[PDB]
Design a protein around this motif. Sequence first.
Motif, PDB file in Angstrom:
ATOM      1  N   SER A  13       0.814  -1.194   0.000  1.00 16.41           N
ATOM      2  CA  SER A  13       0.000   0.000   0.000  1.00 16.41           C
ATOM      3  C   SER A  13       0.857   1.258   0.000  1.00 16.41           C
ATOM      4  O   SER A  13       0.399   2.307  -0.468  1.00 16.41           O
ATOM      5  N   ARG A  61       1.742   1.530  -3.700  1.00 18.71           N
ATOM      6  CA  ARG A  61       0.584   1.968  -4.465  1.00 18.71           C
ATOM      7  C   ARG A  61       0.327   3.458  -4.258  1.00 18.71           C
ATOM      8  O   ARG A  61      -0.013   4.169  -5.210  1.00 18.71           O
ATOM      9  N   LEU A  62       0.524   3.962  -3.033  1.00 21.58           N
ATOM     10  CA  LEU A  62       0.496   5.411  -2.832  1.00 21.58           C
ATOM     11  C   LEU A  62       1.567   6.096  -3.665  1.00 21.58           C
ATOM     12  O   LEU A  62       1.357   7.207  -4.150  1.00 21.58           O
ATOM     13  N   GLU A  63       2.732   5.463  -3.831  1.00 22.35           N
ATOM     14  CA  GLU A  63       3.821   6.101  -4.566  1.00 22.35           C
ATOM     15  C   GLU A  63       3.579   6.054  -6.066  1.00 22.35           C
ATOM     16  O   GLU A  63       3.969   6.978  -6.789  1.00 22.35           O
ATOM     17  N   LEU A  64       2.939   4.990  -6.543  1.00 24.48           N
ATOM     18  CA  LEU A  64       2.552   4.913  -7.938  1.00 24.48           C
ATOM     19  C   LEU A  64       1.730   6.123  -8.354  1.00 24.48           C
ATOM     20  O   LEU A  64       1.704   6.469  -9.541  1.00 24.48           O
ATOM     21  N   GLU A  65       1.087   6.799  -7.399  1.00 23.84           N
ATOM     22  CA  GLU A  65       0.263   7.952  -7.749  1.00 23.84           C
ATOM     23  C   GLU A  65       1.117   9.141  -8.177  1.00 23.84           C
ATOM     24  O   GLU A  65       0.739   9.877  -9.096  1.00 23.84           O
ATOM     25  N   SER A  66       2.276   9.343  -7.540  1.00 26.26           N
ATOM     26  CA  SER A  66       3.209  10.356  -8.032  1.00 26.26           C
ATOM     27  C   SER A  66       3.737  10.012  -9.417  1.00 26.26           C
ATOM     28  O   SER A  66       4.031  10.913 -10.205  1.00 26.26           O
ATOM     29  N   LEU A  81       2.101   8.298 -11.850  1.00 21.13           N
ATOM     30  CA  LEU A  81       1.019   8.565 -12.791  1.00 21.13           C
ATOM     31  C   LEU A  81       0.789  10.063 -12.984  1.00 21.13           C
ATOM     32  O   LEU A  81       0.496  10.518 -14.099  1.00 21.13           O
ATOM     33  N   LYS A  82       0.905  10.844 -11.908  1.00 22.35           N
ATOM     34  CA  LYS A  82       0.838  12.296 -12.041  1.00 22.35           C
ATOM     35  C   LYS A  82       1.929  12.815 -12.970  1.00 22.35           C
ATOM     36  O   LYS A  82       1.653  13.607 -13.881  1.00 22.35           O
ATOM     37  N   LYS A 140       1.183  12.275 -16.579  1.00 23.31           N
ATOM     38  CA  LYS A 140       0.255  13.271 -17.103  1.00 23.31           C
ATOM     39  C   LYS A 140       0.953  14.624 -17.229  1.00 23.31           C
ATOM     40  O   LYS A 140       0.990  15.203 -18.320  1.00 23.31           O
ATOM     41  N   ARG A 200      10.878   5.505  -7.740  1.00 18.13           N
ATOM     42  CA  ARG A 200      10.407   6.545  -8.648  1.00 18.13           C
ATOM     43  C   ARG A 200      11.396   6.778  -9.772  1.00 18.13           C
ATOM     44  O   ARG A 200      11.035   6.757 -10.952  1.00 18.13           O
TER      45      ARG A 200
END
Length: 521
Positions: free
Chosen positions: A219, A222-227, A229-230, A233, A268
């Motif tokens: 988890s 998975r929180l780090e995967l959000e940076s 994906l940001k 974009k 990252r």
Amino acid sequence: QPYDDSHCMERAERLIGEIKDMFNESGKFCGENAFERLVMVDKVQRLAIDRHFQNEIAQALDYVYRYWSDCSRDLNSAALGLRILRLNRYPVSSDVLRHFKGNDGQFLCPSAQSEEEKIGSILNLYRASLIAFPEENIMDEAKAFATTYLNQVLQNNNISSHLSKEIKYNLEYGWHTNLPRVEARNYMDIYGENRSWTEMGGNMQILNLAKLDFNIMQSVHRLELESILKWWKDSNLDKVDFARHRHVEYFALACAYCIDAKYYAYRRDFAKLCALATIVDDIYDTYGTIEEIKLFNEAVKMWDSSLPNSLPENIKIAYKAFHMAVNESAEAAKKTQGRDILPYARKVWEHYLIGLTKEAEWLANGYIPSLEEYLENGAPSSGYRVTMLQPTLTLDALLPDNILLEMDYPSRFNELLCLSLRLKGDTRTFKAEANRGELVSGISCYIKDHPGSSEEEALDYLKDLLQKRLKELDQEYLKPNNVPAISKDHAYNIARSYQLLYKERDIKDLVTQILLEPIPL
């Protein structure tokens, strides 16, 4: 504190303490309990929870090493100890296995052993043989024998379901196409579905900590995967027509061995730098004409913040993302490494582009190099090194420049790391685009060196050369020097993650396992 620890994590920290007491009640027990202390190391290591027990493990392995004759009494403990002591950099010899090879090259188990215990011994024999150094014939014979034995064991269906799952996992993944948390995920099921195993004292606490730790750390990733994906974009890369969402796969790869929360920069930056390496390899190999590749090299020589506006939208923003990524990576590295590493960093990236330019010249000029020349330039053109250096530098381990030379280019370690990526890629039978349709390639350079060789003879050579180079790589990797082991471990696991990645190209299964699907508790 604003955030108190989750209840999963409190449970896990408790179990960590109960298992430390298990190591220390094992060490406090006098007499050569060497095998009992090795078996505990085994469990926590297969389950990829060994980072919580590094002192307890070093004590237990020092004991196992001191009483190494007392602990190689039979094939199973000889093999189990050979593998674990060797992977933890103790200097043990594979000679201990010749003592169990009789006639016709069979390997003997104690006759008092049950049929599930014999398969246990042959399983550890198989697993020990995979970490072979060059010119250890017994490893080759051990692997040969144990592959045959274990395959026949399966063809007989008189085997428990968990032992069969263990044989297939071990035969499918081996060592080089594998990572720490991939093994852990498999052994959580393999141990868990073994009633007699889960009933042994302390085993359920190890399995429970393993499951808790997999889920707690999943988890975080998975929180780090959000940076990530940001960034995909924001960097505008999602508009580049020739770039897949490979960045999530690479992030998952990094997470299967780089686990701790403090190492967010490694995961990252591995994800970003490895995604951008792919995009660059696509700009140089397919898209982009000779003109634009030249301006790219120019921008990287000067380190310009952008490209000339007259250039295509695709490549101009690929470049800007690259420039920003290398910079931010270098910054985090300055934070830990205590020094400015962007100069060093940029020179690594030029050597990668030098390597990519050389291969496009060759293709442009109808030039077919020799294999020796192709593999020499194919080390930096494989991209391995640019995906490993900067992320490894963001780790808490200090690598002064005269230490970094023992691990990075020009060391034998980095050369063999690059060669594995290069040779595995050039022996791929099932890449969609195919290698038979490219001028310069490991296959066509072997055939310039051996006129009259078929594409089959070539591929067999490159597959066997990959096997020879991986044994040298394992010996180099496990050879003592001044590089902090955690750095070598990450560099080495980058190489395995590519072996794994090529094997699974089923890659959606890997990301799901590591990133998205927690393990039932």
